[PDB]
Amino acid sequence: GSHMTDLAGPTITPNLQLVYVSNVERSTDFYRFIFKKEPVFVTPRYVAFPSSGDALFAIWSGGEEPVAEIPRFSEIGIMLPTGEDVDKLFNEWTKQKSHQIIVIKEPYTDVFGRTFLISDPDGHIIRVCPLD
Amino acid sequence: GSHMTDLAGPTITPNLQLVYVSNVERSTDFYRFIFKKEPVFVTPRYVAFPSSGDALFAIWSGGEEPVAEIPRFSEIGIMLPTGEDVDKLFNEWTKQKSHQIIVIKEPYTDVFGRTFLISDPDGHIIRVCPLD
Numbered sequence A, B: 001g002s003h004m005t006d007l008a009g010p011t012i013t014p015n016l017q018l019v020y021v022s023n024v025e026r027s028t029d030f031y032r033f034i035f036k037k038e039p040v041f042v043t044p045r046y047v048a049f050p051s052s053g054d055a056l057f058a059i060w061s062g063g064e065e066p067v068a069e070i071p072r073f074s075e076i077g078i079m080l081p082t083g084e085d086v087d088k089l090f091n092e093w094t095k096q097k098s099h100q101i102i103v104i105k106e107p108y109t110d111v112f113g114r115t116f117l118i119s120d121p122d123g124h125i126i127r128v129c130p131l132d
């Protein structure tokens, strides 16, 4: 070709979503349950789960320990194909008994569509909604 | 009738990384600059950028406004092909003259290799680190 397209560095993508956890074992168990998936990389302080493409979601005990009382300003979002899927997942999580699932917001409509919020063991906010 | 017996729900993936922002237009400009990409969609309150694959990174003014000095317990991560790419990006971002970038931590080798930290306009932590 005549196409010198690789002279400006690698692409810059927010391909990691990382949350600080108090205990990696407990959070690994929690996210295995939420995602119905095994992690792709496991170490005692850092565990990664797949996202789309080359992106990852990771839990890490090397940051600052989360404090329950402190308000949070970001969310771990899970986009499902349809609004029916959102309601089915809410029903599944709130009916099953083994795993504690803390509901923060009941299903409602927001900018995302039909959506609900739960908390993880360290107070991280998880949103379920439809695909864009 | 149906010839399918699969009763599984849809794949559950953390495919939305969402942060709360005070000034959507300001944050749109910031992220357009650091990602060198246009948003997928823009509304007054809600803007998304591509992450990898089908995943998105989004900014939203409809949550709770982030407050300076409230500690944060999560990071927006940017994973690059090599450690050398990490140092090169820090040089690029600190050399350019057109956008203020607040540096939290200059480059160094952590337990996972070369890394640095910056802040976004609303105090969200952004980490640059290596894939490998």
Ligand SMILES: COc1ccc(C=O)c2nc3cccc(C(=O)O)c3nc12
Pocket: A018, A041, A043, A045, A046, A060, A062, B111, B112, B129, B130, B131, B132
């Ligand atoms: C923020 O933390 C990380 C980011 C990206 C990584 C790339 O795979 C990564 N890998 C690790 C491998 C071993 C141990 C740790 C640890 O932090 O103890 C790791 N932490 C990592």
